Design a protein around this nucleic acid. Structure first.
Length: 48
DNA sequence: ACAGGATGTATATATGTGACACGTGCCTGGAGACTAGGGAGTAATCCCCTTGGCGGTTAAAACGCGGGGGACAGCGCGTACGTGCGTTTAAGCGGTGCTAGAGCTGTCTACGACCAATTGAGCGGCCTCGGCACCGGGATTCTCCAG
């Protein structure tokens, strides 16, 4: 099955998107400090 | 699971009350030469309305879910409508036998169109109050269980 058709991963949604990559790094670094975060974005379906 | 007993077709035939054929005539297309007016072919103006869609919030759909009271099936019975039979009513299918009134023809005005003016409705274009529209009471009115 794997060797005949390749489907998009769908699991790690940070794959294509460098915005989410740097956000993952940033949130991971902030987690040690644990002081909590507001993440603002317009585009209601980007919050998804 | 039959058979009298009816009713319904199917096939054939013929001559006479309607379908076709043929000649005529004569009103009506067809053909032709002018004269607009009408409509087409562009060229300008003014609108509205889609642009692509997004993410907030709302009303309207849409869905769950009980349950109740109507949609049907069952059963019955009790008229009432068809079925058939005898009568008789009166319509049909031909006739005779007037004259009322279509249908037409002609004649001739009153009537319609044109026809250039003329003007006075009328329609558009803003303005400005009343009049519905929605609201917020409280008081009569229904609807639903409850005895």
């Amino acid at each position: 099955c794997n060797m005949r058709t390749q489907f998009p991963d769908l699991r790690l949604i940070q794959y294509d998107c460098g915005k989410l990559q740097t956000l993952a790094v940033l949130l991971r670094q902030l987690k040690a400090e644990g002081h909590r975060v507001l993440i603002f974005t317009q585009m209601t379906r980007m919050l998804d």
